[PDB]
Amino acid sequence: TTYAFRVARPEDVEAIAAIDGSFTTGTVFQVAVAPDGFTLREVAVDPPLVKVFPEDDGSGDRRTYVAVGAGGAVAGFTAVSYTPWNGRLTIEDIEVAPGHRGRGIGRGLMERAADFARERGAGHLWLEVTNVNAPAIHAYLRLGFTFCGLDTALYLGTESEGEQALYMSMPC
Amino acid sequence: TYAFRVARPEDVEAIAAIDGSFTTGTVFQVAVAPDGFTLREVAVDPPLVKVFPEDDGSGDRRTYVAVGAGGAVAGFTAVSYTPWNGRLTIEDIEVAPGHRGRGIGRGLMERAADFARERGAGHLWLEVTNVNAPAIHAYLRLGFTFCGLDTALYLGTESEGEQALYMSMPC
Ligand SMILES: NCCC[C@H](N)CC(=O)N[C@@H]1[C@H](O)[C@@H](OC(N)=O)[C@@H](CO)O[C@H]1NC1=N[C@@H]2C(=O)NC[C@@H](O)[C@H]2N1
Ligand SMILES: NCCC[C@H](N)CC(=O)N[C@@H]1[C@H](O)[C@@H](OC(N)=O)[C@@H](CO)O[C@H]1NC1=N[C@@H]2C(=O)NC[C@@H](O)[C@H]2N1
């Protein structure tokens, strides 16, 4: 019980904001576009890519969960979003604080997302991940997500141009 | 044979009747691997009948209309601009059942392209179900290529079993 999980309250919103999800990676997922399909291959990059997410990301059925340590600091969060149309719970964000990884916070937050999904009658969880976010992709694969598609054009004209939006899902 | 203009309130009821329901002897089959996605056009026998659902789950917006002699709508396109990624979404483009093979598709998409360059768009983008081979062939003809897909988009919908394919082209 190193970490407790609960619905986020107003005092958590400011702590959530500071966990921006910025990462370093020695690998990226390269997207190869053919006329008849798309291939993902993990490739080493030297020196390591430093990715800071932009301040402008282009943005009852909503919910934010938070992982809290003994001193009351937010160690992680997930913001989820339900669309009844296709029974999709979108994992809009999931982050673990830099110094709190390898302690089952990721799994715990996703388990709370899954609880909300079954509460709303969702058929699948779904998330967007940039092809350069190899650490997150490995984390999502570990938690049972698989690639369900991509949009190689989504980040065109954005601060993230050169990257591809990869889509992952899992049933519940 | 056909003139193009911005759609007016009296066109809304005619636009509604043009749902784009089709028959096809082929579909684009989606193969999911752990490391990617493959699209292969495959014959289906007997022909697939696709009726689009009434519930589709839905300055920078614009609707164009193709008009014949006698002033009847022969087709339309609704487009949508997002400055964030300079994307003009072709939200819908349909030609009336009896008016195909007359360059209405091309004409409507040319009006979409004019709006894109007017707004400074970097690319056009559309969604098409994998079973809509006729539309996919039309879009390929007009210069669109596949830029991705979402095999999970239609889960829990009337269209479950189909995959949402994404196509784009630069301006
Ligand atoms: N920020 C922490 C991570 C947040 C989550 N993982 C969600 C995510 O992936 N957001 C990414 C990320 O903010 C960043 O992408 C890169 N590569 O940095 C920017 C591009 O600059 O695009 C975002 N994507 C978007 N898709 C949405 C869309 O289609 N319509 C509406 C609008 O919401 C769109 N924004
Ligand atoms: N009439 C011709 C179609 C013209 C266009 N290309 C529009 C299109 O493709 N609509 C399809 C089509 O209505 C149908 O799909 C099948 N397979 O029939 C249903 C599945 O029931 O899903 C629609 N898609 C959607 N995507 C959107 C989304 O992501 N969020 C919000 C909302 O807008 C969503 N709706």
Numbering used by the authors:
A (entry chain A): 7 to 65, 73 to 185
B (entry chain B): 8 to 65, 73 to 185
What do the study authors state?
Here, we report a noncanonical FAD-dependent enzyme Orf1 that adds a glycine-derived N-formimidoyl group to glycinothricin to form the antibiotic BD-12. X-ray crystallography was used to investigate this complex enzymatic process, which showed Orf1 has two substrate-binding sites that sit 13.5 Å apart unlike canonical FAD-dependent oxidoreductases. One site could accommodate glycine and the other glycinothricin or glycylthricin. The resultant product is no longer sensitive to aminoglycoside-modifying enzymes, a strategy that antibiotic-producing species employ to counter drug resistance in competing species.
Almost all ST BGCs encode a ST-resistant N-acetyl transferase (NAT), a self-resistance enzyme, that acts on STs. Given the sttE gene encoded in the Streptomyces lavendulae BCRC12163, the gene product was expressed and subjected to probe its drug resistance scope. We then determined the structures of SttE in complex with ST-F or glycylthricin with CoA, of which crystals were packed in space group P1 and P212121 and determined at resolutions of 2.42 and 2.36 Å, respectively. The structure of SttE revealed a single core domain of a general control non-derepressible 5 (GCN5)-related N-acetyltransferase (GNAT) architecture, which is composed of seven extended β-strands and three α-helices. Both the extended strand β7 and β-hairpin between αA and β2 establish the substantial protein interface promoting protein dimerization, where D164 specifically interacts with R101 and W139 via electrostatic interactions. In the microbial susceptibility assay, the E. coli test strain that harbored a sttE-containing plasmid displayed a diminished inhibition zone, in which glycylthricin or ST-F was added, indicating that SttE is a ST-modifying enzyme and the N-fomimidylation or N-iminoglycination is antagonistic towards the acetylation of SttE. D106 appears to be the base deprotonating the β-amine group for the acetylation modification to take place, while it is a bit far away from the terminal amine group of 4. Its nucleophilicity, nonetheless, may well be enhanced by two mainchain oxo groups (E105 and E141), thus accounting for the equivalent activity of SttE towards 4 and 7.
